[PDB]
């Protein structure tokens, strides 16, 4: 039952405070037995490891179980369950009896919450007698051992709240192995790649900066993904030997050619993993915390956003700046959290510019579609908001975008519904409360900034309000060129179209509609001319928006925001 020497203390990295504590709370009771016997003190300790799943709790237990060399008893909660009436409780009793008989010994109750769940809620008889048997077992250790040979019980669980309070109190030490920091992620990558061949240009400082929400388990997949990149080129050379061996798309042929050479293998040359592969591996790997609840990064870049230079400078200084280089903004005394409220008339680019920031910052992105978090049950709407900021904090830096936010934070009045007033007060505490949310950047977009609660629109929650209004005559030239060149006439005609007095009051959405109406005028011109050539004598002309088509659109498209001042004020 001796611990196998397959996991090494070097295999666990990024945790140093934890390994510093375990040197006096696990190593000393088990290895320094004589020191405890000098004072006649029974130093039987119990250490509970808890944290997010994937934070190397099981590997830490096995790492320190091979670094000590004492008897190790790995226990999995389902393994102590039997079909007989009394066999289930007898198996747990035999575990602690054997540990005392083999003192000094280390018990590892991995996933202890599976069998040691609350007996005050799970009202069964086997389940309650298993919990009571563990308490009795963990107390026999403190008394039945020969004083100088202590027994330490290690338990790991990612749901410490499910434990029975009468059992959770029996673990003197609880260690919270949280998500690794930037310094810790660098050490984990080195310990995961220490047996691999790297191309000597791997900058782990950059790798740690580009993995904001990763845990120890997630970083293993990045190394695992990066390894497959190096061997991707060694499979194409294998497919070439198969494609040229023989005389249904391309992927289907690969699965069939490799099936044919099933009894024959080709040695793969050893290759190093370059920095480009690692940078490519990070994009292919989604963090365990990012699996659900996170929106896909918008495709919009700054090349899609025309004009809005003032808005672009504010969003770069408030969000994109601190995300990319937080060290510079920390020195001047800028908190790593921003609150931006984009507001203005509809169609002027509020959502577009907030989708470029989510894309240019290259950070994690969560998008909320108006009142998307509301639920019919009493507590499920406030719980969704609290869980929303729990994910964002765990994966900082993160950008929270509230599109059409006036439906989620209505101004709190007496006439306001109670169910919609609890969500507002929930957001007040999440944005700025006892638990600071540093690393969460919030963007709000709305047409009615005066309908947002006045407590939200304060610094620390949504500090800055950026007005995104109607473009000027000079701005409409940049926007029309931006819309045209991103969808394919030249540029001299686009300037004439955008500067026309018929485009007075056009918003950003009207210019996009103007281009569509010009394209529709092009198709009518194509349709009529195609029939005339086809019928008279095999007929396909090039569809291109000509200047004559822009004339039809200008006489067809009218502005949509009739009264900008209704949205320009307040």
């Amino acid at each position: 039952r001796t611990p196998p020497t397959k996991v090494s203390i070097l295999d666990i990295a990024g945790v140093d405070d934890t390994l510093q504590r375990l040197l006096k709370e696990v190593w000393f009771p088990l290895r320094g037995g004589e020191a405890c016997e000098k004072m006649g003190y029974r130093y039987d300790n119990g250490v509970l490891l808890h944290g997010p799943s994937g934070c190397g709790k099981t590997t830490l237990a096995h790492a320190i179980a091979g670094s000590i060399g004492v008897a190790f008893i790995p226990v999995s909660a389902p393994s102590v369950i039997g079909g007989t009436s009394g066999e289930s409780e007898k198996n747990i009793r035999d575990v602690f009896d054997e540990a005392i008989r083999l003192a000094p010994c280390l018990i590892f109750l991995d996933q202890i919450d599976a069998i040691a769940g609350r007996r005050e809620s799970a009202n069964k008889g086997m389940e309650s007698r298993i919990v009571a048997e563990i308490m009795n077992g963990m107390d026999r250790i403190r008394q039945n051992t020969p004083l100088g040979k202590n027994v330490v019980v290690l338990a790991a669980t990612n749901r410490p709240e499910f434990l029975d309070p009468a059992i959770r109190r029996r673990f003197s030490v609880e260690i919270d192995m949280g998500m690794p920091s930037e310094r810790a992620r660098e050490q984990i990558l080195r310990s995961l790649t220490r047996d691999l061949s790297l191309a000597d240009d791997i900058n782990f400082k950059e790798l740690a900066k580009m993995t904001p929400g990763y845990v120890g388990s997630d970083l293993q997949y990045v190394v695992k993904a990066a390894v497959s990149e190096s061997f991707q080129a060694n499979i194409d050379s294998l497919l070439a030997q198969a494609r040229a061996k023989h005389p249904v798309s391309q992927p289907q042929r690969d699965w069939l050619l490799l099936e044919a050479h099933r009894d024959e293998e080709v040695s793969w040359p050893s290759t190093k993993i370059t920095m480009e592969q690692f940078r490519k591996a990070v994009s292919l790997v989604q963090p365990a915390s990012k699996r659900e609840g996170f929106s896909t990064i918008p495709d919009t870049t700054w090349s899609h956003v025309g004009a809005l230079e003032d808005v672009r400078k504010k969003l770069e200084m408030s969000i994109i700046g601190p995300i990319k280089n937080p060290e510079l903004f920390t020195r001047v005394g800028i908190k790593p959290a921003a609150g931006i409220l984009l507001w203005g008339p509809p169609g002027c680019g509020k959502t577009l510019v907030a989708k470029a920031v989510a894309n240019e910052s290259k950070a994690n992105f969560i998008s909320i579609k108006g009142p998307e978090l509301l639920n019919k049950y009493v507590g499920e709407s406030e719980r969704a908001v609290r869980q929303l900021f729990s994910r964002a904090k765990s994966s900082a830096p993160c950008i929270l975008f509230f599109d059409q936010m006036d439906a989620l934070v209505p101004r709190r009045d007496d006439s306001l519904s109670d169910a919609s007033a609890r969500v507002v007060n929930t957001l007040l505490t999440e944005l700025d409360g006892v638990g600071d949310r540093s690393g969460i950047y919030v963007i709000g977009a709305t047409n009615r900034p005066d309908m947002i609660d006045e407590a939200i629109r304060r610094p620390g929650r949504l500090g800055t309000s950026i007005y995104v209004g109607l473009p000027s005559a000079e701005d409409r030239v940049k926007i029309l060129k931006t819309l045209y060149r991103n969808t394919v006439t030249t540029d001299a005609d686009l300037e004439k179209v955008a500067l026309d007095l018929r485009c007075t009051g056009f918003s950003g959405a009207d210019l996009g509609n103007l281009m569509q109406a010009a394209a529709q005028a092009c198709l009518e011109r194509v349709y009529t001319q195609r029939q005339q050539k086809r019928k008279e004598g095999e007929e396909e002309i090039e569809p291109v928006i000509t200047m004559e088509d822009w004339e039809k659109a200008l006489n067809e498209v009218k502005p949509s925001v009739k009264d900008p001042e209704k949205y320009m004020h307040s």
Binding site: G83, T84, K376, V378
Partner: peptide
Amino acid sequence: VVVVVVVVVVVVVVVVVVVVVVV
């Protein structure tokens, strides 16, 4: 004859709801 431990079905619960008012 040995009696084995057998798992069974679970109980049902109640859920509160919130209802809006147009007035």
